[PDB]
Design a protein around this ligand. Sequence first.
Ligand code: HEM
Ligand SMILES: COc1ccc(-c2nn(-c3ccccc3)cc2Cn2ccnc2)cc1
Length: 394
Amino acid sequence: ATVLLEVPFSARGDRIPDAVAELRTREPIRKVRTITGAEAWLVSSYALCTQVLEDRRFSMKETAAAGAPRLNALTVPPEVVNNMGNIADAGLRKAVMKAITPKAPGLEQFLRDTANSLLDNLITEGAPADLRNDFADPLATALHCKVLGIPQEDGPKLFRSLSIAFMSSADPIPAAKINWDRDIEYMAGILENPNITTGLMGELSRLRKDPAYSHVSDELFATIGVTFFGAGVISTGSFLTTALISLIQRPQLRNLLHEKPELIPAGVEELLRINLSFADGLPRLATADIQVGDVLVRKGELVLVLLEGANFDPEHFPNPGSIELDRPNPTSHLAFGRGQHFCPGSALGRRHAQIGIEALLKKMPGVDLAVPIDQLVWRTRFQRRIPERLPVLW
Ligand code: HEM
Ligand SMILES: COc1ccc(-c2nn(-c3ccccc3)cc2Cn2ccnc2)cc1
């Protein structure tokens, strides 16, 4: 006898398990057991993943309900699971989304300067260099301090919350509440700090004192800062890191993008499509009985939308494991989700990766792994898949 199939299948971010394609072909929605012991429906085809994400009766907010089957333990207060809904109800969605576009004058040049300085320091120190800890993550942290309007010198401490905040744990995490409360206190202080006049926090600070927002809570304002810093930094740092592995693995593509940087946006779009950064399916709780493929999902059941299921589906992306810069449907992947909860930072995440890669290829055109790929250490029980270190030479 065997036990019910357990998710996640693998913490490795450098290869997709053969099991994904087998499930997609034979059982594109099928029952699995999560790390908490709960049962869930794992959805692994493009067509069914899109159906789930585009039907709001598969609810994000209700995943936080007491007694629900859980993918993993909450690491934030349950109301924060509905963060974007709370932002919209407060009348803040347009202002938040304007503050986090990569369009602020000087932002791209800031990103370019920061990337180049980080790379110069690695060259001075000599190979091997760690492109996660000493390039991709600092670049993500610096970008998000700039976008939020907060001091660069505060970035490192805020960053150090993230290896716990973004755990994917079977049980509640005591350190997560310690760090959450401290970071909330920090952002609350930022809102009262007269030096903070730019970026997302500068704008929130002004709206907070505007009569049209006098009954929006100070807790929500601080929460926006904590959640956008954390989600943005973890997502961009982790995506860039694993994208760099996929690029290093492909010397022909590396050289092409070095020789024609105008193709970097199309290359980043394919790197997004093939990215394994999300460690778990996206969770949703059914609020009605809904037919998904051959399965009638019942009200109250947990559904997990496997992004690499959709993004490697050959019915939608032929030759799915190959980076092709000339696909006719290049942005139709689900790397940023789909529907009501589509990533509000998508443009910023694209630009972070594009500029980081452009700078790396100019400074280190011969970049290559400094260890055999099987020597990378894949973080476990985390909401992203990332190597603990990414050692390179050039
Ligand atoms: C390449 C980088 C990024 C990737 C791959 C990514 C991926 C995603 C995905 C897949 C979702 C949907 C989650 C779901 O539907 O359950 C999402 C949502 C979200 N992302 Fe991103 N993201 C990235 C960058 C960013 C940045 C830069 C920010 C903020 C500065 C950000 C903030 C958020 C937030 C707040 C949500 C929740 C949206 C909602 O619930 O409506 N992300 N992201
Ligand atoms: C729906 O927009 C969201 C945005 C962010 C989060 C989230 N922020 N942080 C976090 C960030 C910084 C410090 C500490 C915690 C962790 C999560 C993800 N998480 C945990 C439990 N359930 C979801 C959530 C929603």
